[PDB]
Design a protein around this ligand. Structure first.
Ligand SMILES: CCCCCCCCO[C@@H]1O[C@H](CO)[C@@H](O)[C@H](O)[C@H]1O
Ligand SMILES: CCCCCCCCO[C@@H]1O[C@H](CO)[C@@H](O)[C@H](O)[C@H]1O
Ligand SMILES: CCCCCCCCO[C@@H]1O[C@H](CO)[C@@H](O)[C@H](O)[C@H]1O
Ligand SMILES: CCCCCCCCO[C@@H]1O[C@H](CO)[C@@H](O)[C@H](O)[C@H]1O
Ligand SMILES: CCCCCCCCO[C@@H]1O[C@H](CO)[C@@H](O)[C@H](O)[C@H]1O
Ligand SMILES: CCCCCCCCO[C@@H]1O[C@H](CO)[C@@H](O)[C@H](O)[C@H]1O
Ligand SMILES: CCCCCCCCO[C@@H]1O[C@H](CO)[C@@H](O)[C@H](O)[C@H]1O
Ligand SMILES: CCCCCCCCO[C@@H]1O[C@H](CO)[C@@H](O)[C@H](O)[C@H]1O
Ligand SMILES: CCCCCCCCO[C@@H]1O[C@H](CO)[C@@H](O)[C@H](O)[C@H]1O
Ligand SMILES: CCCCCCCCO[C@@H]1O[C@H](CO)[C@@H](O)[C@H](O)[C@H]1O
Ligand SMILES: CCCCCCCCO[C@@H]1O[C@H](CO)[C@@H](O)[C@H](O)[C@H]1O
Ligand SMILES: CCCCCCCCO[C@@H]1O[C@H](CO)[C@@H](O)[C@H](O)[C@H]1O
Lengths: 306, 306, 306
């Protein structure tokens, strides 16, 4: 079927729904915006889940190949990540169904990493050229997503465990990723995944603020600072990133963008850097809006599905 | 003599004695268990120290070779680490003798790293293939051990310095270690040392809780989360680790296991994740119990000493 | 002109002026010492700025080459760093002019890194052999300097953003730097830059204490611990560092030394490790004093300028 990376679309939309949700008491109309984005993300997730179920049943060898690949395996983590985010959305309407989805996605991502990420340490399969930003998905983003989802359900201390796993995994991987990028020019076909480099600090602070009841403290400010540094670097790099043209892979940026938006709501609520917060929230919405527009355009030309 | 790595045996036993010690007021019988493990660890340490003194006097070129090796040097750090842990045990009976051992081990480990770990930065001796988990011993575990031992003696601020040295050294080394493991299959003869990968987060949180008066805070929960992630990964990898058979090298795991047990006592005392704490404490005791049983078995067959 | 690295001289002197400044209320005579060092640093900075302006106008291709070099570009960051430090000095006399310099240096360093540090991620220019301690200048030291300068002006939350950018950039680069040093013997002509390895933890804690109102907390103690570990390692390595002779490049050490001095004033004020603080402050002053003496000597022999 469907390329596994397309789960980035409901991921980005779902995460953006949750960001707007957190503005509802400052600005009541934010709830309708959140509900609309959340319904659209959920519908797209349902479709993509059904399509992936079909892939498993009738194209299993494609799934097997992607699973055993030391690079492509990572995109599978998008499935449980999006499952948890849809759970977080649904919590506003039905906490029971939300909790089921959150546990399925949590157990699923932990099983996934435990099976596949650890296996890499056997050596001889992963190569230096396998050192791609997509590795953040199973290693980092999945753990932060479990952290914030478990906090939503009231399991704050368990959430902190998943939080720590993601934060330390991030700091442990990024050094070798950035060195690899410096030495080796990432080929155009993979370059859109540079957008995932935006994610770690913003997804980290978003998850942190979810678990710590929105307390904007020293750690949060530290994370925002490195997050904005990476944003500036990626903005400068953008023309290089899209050297060979705009493409649907640019949804890679939506994880970081939506988390910039979510964290910005908490900085704003805490009266920390409110002007920066407004900029971050507007910027991220405009960019995801542009992703949506370019996606509708592609669907319009029959250039969406493979 | 005696392979230097055999100091891992009294290390694991001593650390486990200290874990049980910290349960004595919740469960008084824990003290007898702690005292027994502590006496056995101390007796084994005495024997191994005397044997290593004999190695220094009559097999000095073997010591010299191990010292100058960019891989084997690390195991020497087990000597001052175990010396400090025996000091921590003895403190319950004789604080004066305890303090002497703790300072000997602290000054010894710091001198050792200052001489040998820094020397590696001259280049040309350490190679990519030298990137082994054993490096954590002089670089990380030795500093955490000094931190907690100095805290025991009431030198908390000095303990925090050693703590920071170990924590930042850990985060600075692990990125390149895990990348190396991914690319290069660690040969079977070294694979038991994968057990040292369990140690950092647990030894870190154990030392931290020792210095901060057992306050189970955000940092502690973060460390436990990454610690359990690594545990799960190593459990999945275990059949690969022991591909060529069970061996005495598996005492490599005891450092992390004993620190899981120790930290679990503090999480339990703090009423944080008590169910996880009970599991961690029981699991680690069972695994170290299995190490002891397999060791008695080897001694029984005359397959212990070289 | 003038080698760009010579900006390390007013950098080291300016930073040391700020350290003495922070003793003025414990020891009033410290103010005169601070004022003298600050005037000398400012005068040297003025001279070097004018000389670099001349280089830009009449030797532009030399500047272009250094800018595009994946190793030599880093020294350019010394210009905005020193500009901010001179601003911090001048603040005691004229806060308006100080603020102008601080914003010029902040915007300048951020623009510099955004343009050049990010560009490295395109690959194919930076090589493994490009992995030099000088990279800390644009990546780490510049951000910490902005953090503390902005805090001086009362912009603490913005300062925390720059702080986080520098701290996380540090932890992200150092792993690959130390692995490179282990494997590859850094050639003598670059070895004096090993002194920059002293800087990160001390510049970090100095900036942190500037933003957090001098509160010597757990993070501060942790940073000092790793800072002293690196000091000990570099002391052991010093004879290797200067294998081919003493040279003006040794001003590389002044960044870390001056930050040891500055942070020591805050530990002393906070009654934390006062004995260590006194040692650190005296040691760093003696070493920078020796740099000054060797520099006067070189100027005396006409061996200073190229
Ligand atoms: C999201 C789900 C991804 C799962 C991919 C599973 C990869 C399976 O792996 C395969 O399992 C087979 C049995 O069915 C074995 O024959 C093979 O040895 C093994 O390659
Ligand atoms: C998102 C949900 C993911 C869980 C899917 C589990 C599929 C793994 O399946 C297992 O993986 C092993 C290697 O890692 C292989 O031995 C086999 O394919 C199988 O044992
Ligand atoms: C590589 C990752 C960087 C980690 C930075 C951790 C910073 C922790 O910082 C701590 O936060 C508390 C709340 O504001 C403060 O009260 C403490 O005094 C402060 O040190
Ligand atoms: C998380 C970032 C998005 C938050 C949106 C805030 C936009 C509101 O804008 C603000 O409204 C204030 C009062 O409500 C006015 O006082 C401010 O001047 C104005 O900037
Ligand atoms: C635990 C103790 C380990 C110490 C190992 C010391 C390594 C000594 O090193 C050697 O010292 C000799 C002198 O005795 C010199 O001749 C040699 O140059 C040097 O290799
Ligand atoms: C656990 C106690 C350890 C301290 C032992 C110190 C032995 C080091 O000895 C020194 O090491 C140098 C290289 O690193 C060599 O020059 C020589 O062997 C010697 O100078
Ligand atoms: C790479 C290493 C990860 C470091 C994580 C540091 C987390 C510090 O976290 C801090 O702990 C305090 C105590 O609970 C809190 O009050 C602070 O608000 C919290 O930020
Ligand atoms: C550090 C982990 C080991 C701690 C051992 C705890 C085992 C005790 O077990 C517990 O006893 C409680 C009261 O004492 C009972 O109320 C609990 O239900 C029970 O789980
Ligand atoms: C501190 C200031 C450093 C700036 C160095 C600038 C490097 C300029 O770069 C050059 O700019 C030229 C135009 O002037 C172009 O022709 C070139 O493509 C480009 O190499
Ligand atoms: C300390 C103040 C530094 C700011 C100087 C900016 C000089 C950069 O100039 C730019 O750099 C690009 C590559 O990175 C090149 O395209 C060109 O030289 C130019 O566009
Ligand atoms: C790789 C970088 C290491 C980061 C270490 C972060 C330590 C944060 O530590 C926090 O500091 C506060 C102030 O003292 C305390 O109250 C917290 O309880 C303590 O955890
Ligand atoms: C930051 C490190 C430099 C601080 C300099 C301190 C030197 C003063 O020295 C100290 O003076 C005290 C009272 O003023 C005496 O009581 C102490 O015994 C003495 O050590």
């Amino acid at each position: 079927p469907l390329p596994t990376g397309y789960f980035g679309i409901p991921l980005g939309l779902a995460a953006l729904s949750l960001a707007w949700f957190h503005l509802e008491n400052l600005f009541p109309a934010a709830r309708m915006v959140s509900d609309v984005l959340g319904i659209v993300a959920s519908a797209v997730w349902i479709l993509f889940i059904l399509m992936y179920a079909y892939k498993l049943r009738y194209y299993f060898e494609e799934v097997r190949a992607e699973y055993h690949s030391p690079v492509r395996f990572s995109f599978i983590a998008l499935i449980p990540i999006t499952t948890m985010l849809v759970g977080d959305i649904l919590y506003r309407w039905n906490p029971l169904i939300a909790e089921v989805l959150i546990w399925i996605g949590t157990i699923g991502q932990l099983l996934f990493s435990t099976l596949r990420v650890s296996e890499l340490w056997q050596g001889g399969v992963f190569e230096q050229k396998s050192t791609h930003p997509s590795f953040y998905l199973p290693a980092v983003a999945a753990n932060f997503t479990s952290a914030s989802s478990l906090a939503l359900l009231g399991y704050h201390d368990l959430g902190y465990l998943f939080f720590g796993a993601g934060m330390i995994a991030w700091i442990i991987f990024e050094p070798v990723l950035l060195q690899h990028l410096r030495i080796s020019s990432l080929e155009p076909q993979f370059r859109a995944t540079m957008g995932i480099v935006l994610a770690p600090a913003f997804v980290c602070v978003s998850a942190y603020l979810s678990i710590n009841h929105g307390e904007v403290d020293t750690l949060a400010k530290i994370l925002w600072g490195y997050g904005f540094l990476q944003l500036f670097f990626l903005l400068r790099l953008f023309p290089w990133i899209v050297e060979k043209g705009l493409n649907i892979g640019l949804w890679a940026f939506s994880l970081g963008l939506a988390s910039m938006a979510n964290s910005a709501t908490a900085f704003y609520h805490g009266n920390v850097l409110q002007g920066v917060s407004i900029f971050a929230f507007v910027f991220s919405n405009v960019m995801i809006g542009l992703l949506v527009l370019m996606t509708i355009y592609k669907l319009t030309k029959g250039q969406f599905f493979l």
